[PDB]
UniProtKB/Swiss-Prot annotation:
Changing L130P: Loss of interaction with GSK3B. Abolishes GSK3B-mediated phosphorylation. Prevents beta-catenin accumulation in the cytoplasm and nucleus. Prevents the Wnt-induced transcription. Decreases PKA-mediated phosphorylation of GSK3B. The record marks L130 as: Required for GSK3B interaction. It comes from Homo sapiens (Human). Its main location: cytoplasm. This is GSK3B-interacting protein. Residues 41-45 are annotated as: Required for PRKAR2A interaction.
Length: 139
């Protein structure tokens, strides 16, 4: 007389019975674009002024809009999809449907071209490894 409500799971998924094979007609990766998006934003946030997911549009599983504001206040809006990161605007929450702007593979090969300061910031974190091995390694 009831059904399964919306509870919380302290596990990956409720799977007590196992045996049958799952792979069949639908092979969904279960990859959430928002998931990957918020992961990207956090990791590269240090190399820009402010970066955040676009809350003025939409984001549903396959597609998520992100915004990035570099150190020189330059803003890029990114349509994150399975095709990678596709710039859809150069302003905050700016997405144009006629922009045939090229999409890149990762955020690295994208933002490295979007802000030279990002590259320099990478160099700073890179030289940290250099001096790390200089101090600890030969002593």
């Amino acid at each position: 007389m009831e059904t399964d409500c919306n509870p919380m799971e302290l596990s990956s998924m409720s799977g007590f019975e196992e045996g049958s094979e799952l792979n069949g007609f639908e092979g969904t990766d279960m990859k959430d674009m928002r998931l990957e998006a918020e992961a990207v934003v956090n990791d590269v946030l240090f190399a820009v002024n402010n970066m955040f997911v676009s809350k003025s549009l939409r984001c549903a599983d396959d597609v998520a809009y992100i915004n990035v504001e570099t150190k020189e206040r330059n803003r890029y809006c990114l349509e994150l999809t399975e095709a990678g990161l596709k710039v859809v605007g150069y302003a905050f929450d700016q997405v144009d449907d006629h922009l045939q702007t090229p999409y890149h593979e990762t955020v690295y090969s994208l933002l490295d071209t979007l802000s030279p300061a990002y590259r320099e910031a990478f160099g700073n974190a890179l030289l940290q490894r250099l001096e790390a091995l200089k101090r600890d390694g030969q002593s």
